[PDB]
Design a protein around this ligand. Structure first.
Ligand SMILES: [Zn+2]
Lengths: 308, 198, 383, 131, 51
């Protein structure tokens, strides 16, 4: 399967910025503020929880959508068919439940709160899905409960949420919006770690709430956190952020390097093979459904699979 | 009557702040060994980037200067030729006096210091029966601070890691009062005192 | 957290240890305990934060690639931060090692004993169901493709039951209940292999030598090197039944056949041709410690005695420089420095060309490279 | 006490230099016999993380990793391109291997000896089960 | 990482593909407390198509 000159996918998981708020024992919310120290112009910033702050809310909104069904561009329809059929046959044979679960787990346990949970007493993820009929779905004390996939499945509203997500991923035009709020508890005067801005010098990426500036975890940082599902790779140890070549950031070197045949554009070169491997009435191997899981997640991330 | 004895750090790879902090540690241990307080310090190369290769000990007393400078740690890093000890010299021509002061107001700017300040304030105000709201004392958004250097330090009686945020401010040799902080710095509450920057 | 360890055994697989520490302190299933320790390594800052394993099949550091360092750090921390008294948790871990076995094959060490990678049971690890029920732990030896009978019960290891069409304690739980049907799992040239398996554990067996339990697996891998596959215990035990006789016959038979069937004449005959497979297939087992590497010992003894028998046909065998760097542990750099210093005799003047004999190199190893254990005196005072 | 450098840059060559690199190969590093390397390694392991990782965060150079655990600096290059090692500083372009600059932490090299390099007798289990 | 005709690049090592390259994007998003987004425009239809 050749790689066309115009191929692009629009992303399905669309998160928003993660805005922080501080809740005082009077139960009113004031946005976080961060010192910006400068020595005499490196301007290192410092965001710590205020003194009397009872706890800290972290709100954001993530939208799952069925933008992965049709490629946003294919200058050659011959490849558009083999990808829309790829998605259809994936969904039919191995349903969306695995990708949906591995996304909603990152949503529902604090994983978008990247480092802000190292020293936290307890954080509760309250979740308000949009096409919803019940109340809010709330997970609490995520290091005491909801520690593994099973504990998630044990919550009474979990199946409905995953069903909504796989619907949004299934329907021709479905979507599913979640407003997530994390009532996080930190020790007195604890460090919050919003996303640094790209430029020692630590300068925070920030927004303005109530006219005054507050620190945020970027929408792209959060999208990176929700997409740490890629545990299917050679000698897989811990999940990666889904990428065309599974990259790591702490230890720079990149797994799924296209030398191995487990990058993206290599297992896309075999999409025709995967079509017939799924089309058989018999179930496919575990490794090949791992390859196709990574392929589907890489479509959900969307992007540009071109060669100009 | 300013005697001074400088010390220059030899090793071409050395973190001067650490060595200066250890010199001040041992100076402090001295000033608490004998209750003398009349040995001040100076940094004849207080560059922008770092404290320089030198730390000088200045005193009106002559016996205490060389009594200190032959302490155990100094003779030890002398035989290992890390340090270079000079002799007890006077200097009336280097009128280029400065004041190395422990700028304590820098520790009230770190978040864990603002926490201390607010906790103390409310502990006071509630004793005064006043109404204290810790939700108003918001952190300043931009606190640009003057250039300074920091020498990490610890206390033997209670283990903690504070820092002498030492800062050099120019001055004129207004009077020899002959009193320094235990860390050999000039502090405003005690008799403020400049020192000859050799 | 804080845990208590159970009755630590010496020969107990790491996964077995984690099972019997999970089901001892507070956890129902060991998987929960793995997530608990991962949360622990979250709480105290660490590097096993990311790569600490939660599936029990891949706990031993040889499973993680480019994370074995972190996993051993993790085991070190666990061993001195999470128990009432510190356990020997790291010694049970099967981790990689730098040393190889003779033909281009890597090795994995556990405790003080290094096994070849060639026989590791990457999957479908057997068990002694009886020993499971009595002792309550899984011995490490079950992981290797030599241990085919329980050295304590002389029973073949149950790899697949009737209820469970394939079984392993790493999912069972150190108890006799199959995967599908809950019931006792206990079902069932026997002695020709029982002695071998008992000798594989640190023990003695009448025909097999008293090598260190790192060199026993070396013997086994070498035997599979001769017998092109299919390690059978009977031929092994009978081969060590007449030990100095059988191997001497083998090297004679291999050496004589090579000399007739050689296609190029005598003077240019090389030693990878004659004595090609035995010599280099025994030179590095656990290591060339001639006291323990009994095979290389006997081979070198036989070669030394017959060094000059037929025009020194053995002694004047051309070996390339790179084969001298194997014959005696050295660098092509260092043998180059030796030959330009005129230590060796590059028969034709002027680097991977065959320019040196065996005899001049054997005496060279005797003179300038005889190590502490790679030493001549270990084999000369043998049978 | 007399370290002319801070702790975050304190190396192993100066702190504990003569003892370690003076006992690493008395005749050869068999930890059952090389009793002094055995006890030094036991002491260091038992105090790897004592004071916010004093011993653990000790700077080590490639030419010291090659002697703490037998391998050639080219094999170390192969270990650090495979990211089995942790080169705390980034050499962005094309990996120019500098074998002299203090780049690894001792703790993370002690652990790398504990797996990937625990050879036949250069083995941890020889010293831990001692006095 | 690939050149045309599907061949890996020998210079794009596993350390070269891992280097994070930066981009710059303009980012617009609803403020936090903002209720909703108004969007206003005016469209005028005319008979400029007759002649
Ligand atoms: Zn048994």
């Amino acid at each position: 399967l050749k790689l066309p000159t115009n191929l692009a996918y629009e992303r399905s998981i669309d998160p928003s910025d993660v805005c922080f708020f501080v809740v005082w024992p009077d139960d009113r919310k004031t946005p976080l503020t961060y010192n910006s120290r400068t020595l005499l112009p490196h301007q290192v910033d410092f965001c710590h929880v205020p003194y009397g702050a009872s706890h800290i809310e972290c709100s954001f909104s993530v939208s799952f959508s069925s933008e992965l069904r049709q490629p946003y561009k294919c200058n050659s329809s011959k490849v558009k068919q083999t990808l829309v059929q790829l998605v259809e046959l994936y969904e039919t044979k191995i349903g969306w439940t695995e990708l949906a679960t591995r996304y909603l787990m990152n949503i529902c346990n604090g994983k978008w709160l990247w480092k802000n949970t190292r020293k936290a007493y307890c954080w509760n993820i309250v979740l308000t899905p949009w096409p919803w009929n019940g109340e809010k779905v709330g997970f609490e004390d995520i290091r005491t409960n909801y520690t593994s996939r099973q504990d998630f499945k044990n919550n009474k509203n979990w199946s409905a949420i995953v069903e909504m997500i796989k619907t949004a991923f299934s329907s021709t035009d479905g979507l599913a919006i979640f407003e997530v709020r994390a009532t996080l508890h930190l020790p007195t005067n604890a460090m919050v770690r919003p996303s640094q801005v790209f430029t020692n010098s630590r300068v925070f990426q920030s927004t303005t709430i109530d006219g005054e500036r507050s620190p945020i975890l970027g929408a792209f940082k959060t999208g990176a956190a929700i997409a740490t599902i890629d545990d299917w790779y050679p000698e897989a140890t811990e999940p990666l952020r889904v990428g065309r070549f599974g990259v790591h950031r702490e230890d720079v070197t990149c797994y799924r390097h296209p030398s191995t045949g487990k990058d993206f554009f290599s297992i896309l070169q075999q999409a025709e093979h995967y079509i017939e491997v799924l089309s058989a009435n018999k179930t496919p191997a575990q490794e090949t459904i791992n390859d196709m899981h990574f392929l589907m997640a890489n479509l959900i991330k969307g992007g540009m699979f071109q060669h100009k | 009557k300013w005697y001074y004895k400088t010390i220059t750090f030899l090793p071409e790879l050395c973190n001067n702040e650490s060595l200066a902090a250890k010199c001040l540690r041992v100076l402090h241990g001295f000033n608490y060994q004998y209750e003398t307080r009349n040995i001040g310090v100076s940094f004849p190369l207080w560059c922008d980037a770092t404290v320089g290769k030198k730390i000088s000990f200045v005193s009106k007393n002559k016996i205490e200067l060389d009594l200190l400078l032959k302490q155990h740690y100094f003779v030890q890093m002398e035989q290992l030729q890390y340090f270079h000890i000079s002799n007890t010299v006077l200097v009336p021509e280097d009128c280029t006096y400065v004041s190395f002061r422990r700028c304590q107001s820098i520790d009230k700017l770190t978040a864990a210091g603002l926490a201390r300040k607010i906790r103390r304030l409310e502990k006071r105000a509630l004793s005064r029966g006043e109404q204290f709201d810790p939700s108003s004392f918001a952190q300043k958004e931009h606190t640009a601070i003057a250039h300074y250097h920091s020498l990490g330090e610890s206390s033997k009686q209670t283990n903690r890691n504070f820092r002498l945020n030492i800062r050099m401010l120019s001055e004129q040799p207004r009077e020899g009062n002959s009193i320094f902080s235990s860390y050999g710095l000039s502090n405003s509450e005690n008799s403020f005192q400049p020192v000859p920057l050799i | 957290m804080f845990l208590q360890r159970p009755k630590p055994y010496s020969d107990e697989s790491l996964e077995s240890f984690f099972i019997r520490v999970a089901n001892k302190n507070g956890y129902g299933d060991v998987h929960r305990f793995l997530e608990a320790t991962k949360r622990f390594l979250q709480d105290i800052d660490h590097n096993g934060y990311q790569t600490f394993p939660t599936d029990i099949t891949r706990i031993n550091p040889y499973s993680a690639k480019n994370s074995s360092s972190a996993r051993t750090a993790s085991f070190l921390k666990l061993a001195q931060l999470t128990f009432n008294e510190p356990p020997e948790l790291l010694g049970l871990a099967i981790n990689r090692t730098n040393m190889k076995y003779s033909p281009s094959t890597s090795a994995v060490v556990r405790g003080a004993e290094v096994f070849p990678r060639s026989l590791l049971r990457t999957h479908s690890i057997p068990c002694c169901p009886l020993c499971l029920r009595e002792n309550g732990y899984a011995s490490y030896l079950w992981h290797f493709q030599g241990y085919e009978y329980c050295h304590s019960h002389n029973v073949p290891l149950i790899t697949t039951c009737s209820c469970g069409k394939e079984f392993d304690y790493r999912v069972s739980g150190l108890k006799g209940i199959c995967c599908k049907c809950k019931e006792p799992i206990t079902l069932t040239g026997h002695e020709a292999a029982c002695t071998v398996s008992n000798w594989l554990a640190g023990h003695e067996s009448k025909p097999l030598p008293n090598l260190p339990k790192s060199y026993r697996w070396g013997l086994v891998h070498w035997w599979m090197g001769i017998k092109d596959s299919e390690f059978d215990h009977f031929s092994f035990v009978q081969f060590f039944s007449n030990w100095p006789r059988s191997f001497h016959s083998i090297i004679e038979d291999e050496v004589e056949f090579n000399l007739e069937h050689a296609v190029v004449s005598t003077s240019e005959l090389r030693l990878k041709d004659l004595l090609g497979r035995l010599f280099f297939g025994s030179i590095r087992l656990p290591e060339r410690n001639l006291q323990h590497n009994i095979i290389l010992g006997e081979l070198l003894c036989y070669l030394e005695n017959r060094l000059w028998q037929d025009k020194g046909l053995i002694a004047n065998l051309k070996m390339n420089a790179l084969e001298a760097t194997v014959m005696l542990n050295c660098s092509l750099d260092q043998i180059a420095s030796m030959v330009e210093q005129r230590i060796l005799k590059p028969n034709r003047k002027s680097v991977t060309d065959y320019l040196f004999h065996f005899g001049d190199i054997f005496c060279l190893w005797l003179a300038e490279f005889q190590s502490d254990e790679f030493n001549r005196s270990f084999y000369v005072s043998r049978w | 006490e007399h370290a002319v450098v801070s702790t975050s840059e304190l190396r192993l060559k100066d702190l504990l230099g003569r003892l370690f690199f003076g006992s690493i190969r008395l005749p050869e590093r068999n930890l059952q016999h090389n009793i002094i390397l055995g006890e030094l390694l036991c002491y260091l392991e038992n105090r790897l993380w004592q004071d916010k990782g004093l011993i653990a965060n000790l700077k080590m150079n490639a030419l010291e990793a090659t002697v703490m655990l037998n391998c050639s600096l080219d094999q170390i290059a192969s270990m650090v391109e495979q990211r089995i090692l942790k080169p705390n500083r980034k050499s962005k372009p094309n990996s120019p291997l500098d074998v002299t600059d203090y780049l690894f932490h001792f703790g993370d090299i002690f652990c790398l000896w504990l797996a990937e390099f625990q050879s036949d007798e250069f083995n941890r289990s020889f010293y831990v089960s001692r006095w | 990482a690939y050149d045309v005709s599907g061949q890996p690049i020998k210079s794009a090592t596993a350390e070269a593909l891992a280097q994070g390259n930066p981009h710059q994007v303009d980012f617009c998003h609803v403020p936090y407390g903002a209720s909703h987004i108004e969007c206003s425009f005016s469209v005028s239809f005319s008979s400029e198509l007759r002649q």
